[PDB]
């Protein structure tokens, strides 16, 4: 509720103090990772989502995969962001939100390739068809 | 329960052939020491066969499984 | 006999949260009252 009320400063400290007692509540990991994204410490968030996926999900959980994609986007792992959302679309292609995010990552990668003329032909051809 | 666990431990330490002291300890250990409960149920299983020479009750085996 | 129930499943292994979170609520309660 403090997080919904916008009090992330205290909410993070609370989620951390709850996490100290147990490593098996994903929401505590997820709440901490969300605040880490909001606090722009994207590496830590990505690390939490990657290990959360490996520990708690016997399959790639699209919710965690999407949270990871949101962090990866900001984390500069555009390659992994692309790959993570392509994996997500491979897992849930009828979920139009994930499909949008795939299209968005293709757009953001192409934006970089298209801005700098140093980008090569295979990159530009991929960027054109991907875009 | 903690006082009971401490005393029942003393009972098993003084009388390791006391199958009941081990299982009662196991019953408390189930909450806090699953391996301890396994150790107690296993010990009761072992004592019955070797020293009391009576067959092992299935409850002990079920608890070992659980 | 089963030790983990719908009530105990919600309880920590050994850490008590009351003292710290109530200290946090000491800060939050003032904000909720607009002080």
């Amino acid at each position: 509720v403090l997080a919904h009320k916008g009090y992330f400063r205290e909410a993070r400290d609370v989620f951390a103090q709850v996490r100290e007692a147990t490593a098996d509540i994903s929401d505590v990991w997820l709440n901490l990772a969300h605040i880490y994204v909001e606090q722009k410490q994207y590496i830590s968030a990505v690390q939490m989502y990657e290990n959360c996926l490996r520990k708690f999900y016997k399959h790639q959980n699209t919710e965690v995969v999407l949270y990871l994609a949101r962090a990866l986007f900001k984390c500069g792992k555009l390659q992994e962001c692309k790959q993570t959302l392509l994996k997500a679309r491979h897992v849930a292609p009828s979920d139009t939100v994930l499909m949008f995010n795939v299209a968005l990552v293709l757009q953001r990668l192409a934006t970089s390739v298209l801005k700098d003329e140093k980008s090569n032909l295979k990159e530009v051809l991929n960027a054109v068809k991907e875009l | 329960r903690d006082i009971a666990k401490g005393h029942l431990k003393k009972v098993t330490e003084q009388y390791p052939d006391d199958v009941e002291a081990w299982i009662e300890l196991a019953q408390i250990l189930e909450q806090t020491d699953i391996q301890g409960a396994l150790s107690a149920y296993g010990t009761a299983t072992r004592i019955l066969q070797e020293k009391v020479q009576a067959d092992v009750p299935p409850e002990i085996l079920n608890n070992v499984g659980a | 006999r089963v030790w983990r129930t719908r009530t105990t499943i919600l309880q920590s292994t050994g850490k008590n949260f009351s003292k710290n979170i109530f200290a946090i609520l000491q800060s939050v309660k003032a904000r909720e009252e607009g002080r």
Binding site: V1, A3, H4, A11, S26, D27, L30, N31, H34, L66, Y67, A69, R70, F73, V97, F100, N101, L104 | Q27, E30, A37, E59, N62, N63, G65, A66 | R1, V2, W3, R4, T5, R6, T8, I9, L10
Partner: peptide, 27 residues
């Protein structure tokens, strides 16, 4: 100017109920 578009993900601060504990019963 249009505020910068983030990855489309509905923000959920969760407090999910734990799975009901139906652990094996001791005798």
């Amino acid at each position: 100017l249009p505020e910068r578009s983030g990855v489309v993900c509905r923000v959920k601060y969760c407090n999910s109920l734990p799975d009901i504990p139906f652990d094996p019963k001791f005798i």
